[model samples]
Target: IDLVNRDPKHLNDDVVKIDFEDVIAEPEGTHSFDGIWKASFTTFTVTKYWFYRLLSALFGIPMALIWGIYFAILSFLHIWAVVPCIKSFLIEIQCISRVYSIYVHTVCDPLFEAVGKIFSNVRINLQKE
Candidate 1:
């Protein structure tokens, strides 16, 4: 029973306590996000400099594109290594989590290949019978 952890007599009693703020939830207010951007215009103008601002704004496109591609390639390589481990782990429930799966795939790749060899040999022997 719940009383195992506390006074049994209080179990039959009931009480209510509510703070006005907690009971009445407040509605969140919204404001224009562009206002914050406009506030930082002076900082951007200082960085860009008077004459370089125009050229920098134009170059920003290519700079952004290269940065995006760099991150995309890194992300793909990360997935290329992680995905197969996740797929194989899901298939082998005994393997458990993604981390364990990655460890087994990295450290036990040769071991699993050996397991495959044994299974293939068994299948060939059984077929002959």
Candidate 2:
């Protein structure tokens, strides 16, 4: 059925599956090595399925524990320490920049303008005969 022709959910499910088949269609009339692709599909299916199964069996528990612990620590540290620290630091910088900007505009700008005017007409000639 062309039922997959529409629906965002269908597209997402179709693409996200780990199986080797749906998108990898049967060989068309111009397919290379007519029947051997089944070998590759078996290889793909077994290798993907078994390896992930074994790896998950091997690490699934530790994955849960480690992720849980690390996420727990991250939530704690960011919620309590890192976020507050940066918030205060940004506010401090905001205050300092406002004061510094005013000083630069009122004081430094005039001094630099005078220095610029004084140097504007100063010319040097270095020729001898």
Candidate 3:
């Protein structure tokens, strides 16, 4: 069946030819429109963005705090278990990595909370109908 479209003698008794028309029109950007639906669609997109932004503000800080605690435990584990289990250069590298992890998580905790603060201060005003 795959050869039937391309091969002329695929019917086993006769040949066939397919022809396409030339000089086709191209689609301009405004080819399709729904004037009534466009307003609702724009409103939906704007609403979705603000809704998600609010949700991010609500959850971002608590989640960041949870992550900081989790990383703290991991850093402690690396110090207690990983540093002693290795030797020589590996010990130095493991200790440095754990310290760096703890430092980054500590610094980022405030940065995440600041985003929530910024989000809380933002306001959008829709024009009256």
Candidate 4:
């Protein structure tokens, strides 16, 4: 089926395609080693099927456990650790920045105002000699 009209439920199959296909078509031709071709194709399909099966057998439950634990820890940390830490940091920084702004207005603003009043009148002589 064409991808544009494909079922969303079968999207996993569409994306993670590990299908040992109707693979390696050998055309009906004279003097071709057709028997060997058949054997090779059969071997390839059988190997892929069994190897994948063995892999899932070995790692299936362990992988499920790891995935569950990893996500659980992440959610736990996000809720308890990261969120509270960020909240505390923002609270502290908000007060700090407001105080810093006040200091800037009190001192730096007036300093710059005085300096700019004196320096702003300096006219540059732009001439080609």
Best prediction by TM-score:
4
A best-first ranking of the candidates according to their lDDT comes to 2, 4, 3, 1
Off by over 4 Å in 4: 1-32, 95-129
TM-score of each: 0.24, 0.46, 0.36, 0.47
Model 3 score (lDDT):
0.68
TM-score of 4: 0.47
Give per-residue CA lDDT, model 3, range 4-119, as digits (tens).
Answer: 56656457434333222222223567443578546655675577668879989988898888887788889998988887676566756877888899999988888888678756
Q: How do all the candidates rank in terms of TM-score, highest first?
A: 4, 2, 3, 1
RMSD of each: 27.1, 10.4, 28.3, 8.7
- Assess the local accuracy of residue 44 in candidate 3 as a C-alpha lDDT between 0 and 100: 56
Model 1 agreement with the true structure over 32-78: per-residue lDDT tens digits: 47777466655655664666678877887889888888899889977
User: Per-residue alpha-carbon lDDT of model 4 for 1-129, expressed as tens digits?
Assistant: 676958566656755665444445545564457687678767887887888898889879887877887888788888888988877887676777888889878877777766667666787888898
Quote the positional error of residue 65 for candidate 4 in Å.
2.5
Candidate 4: residue 19 lDDT (0-100): 47
Tens digit of per-residue lDDT, candidate 2, span 1-129? 457566555557655566576657756676767489768888877776777788778878977877777788778888899988987887667778888889779867767776777666878999999
Candidate 2 C-alpha error for residue 80, in Å: 2.4
lDDT of 4: 0.74
lDDT of all the models against the reference?
0.66, 0.75, 0.68, 0.74
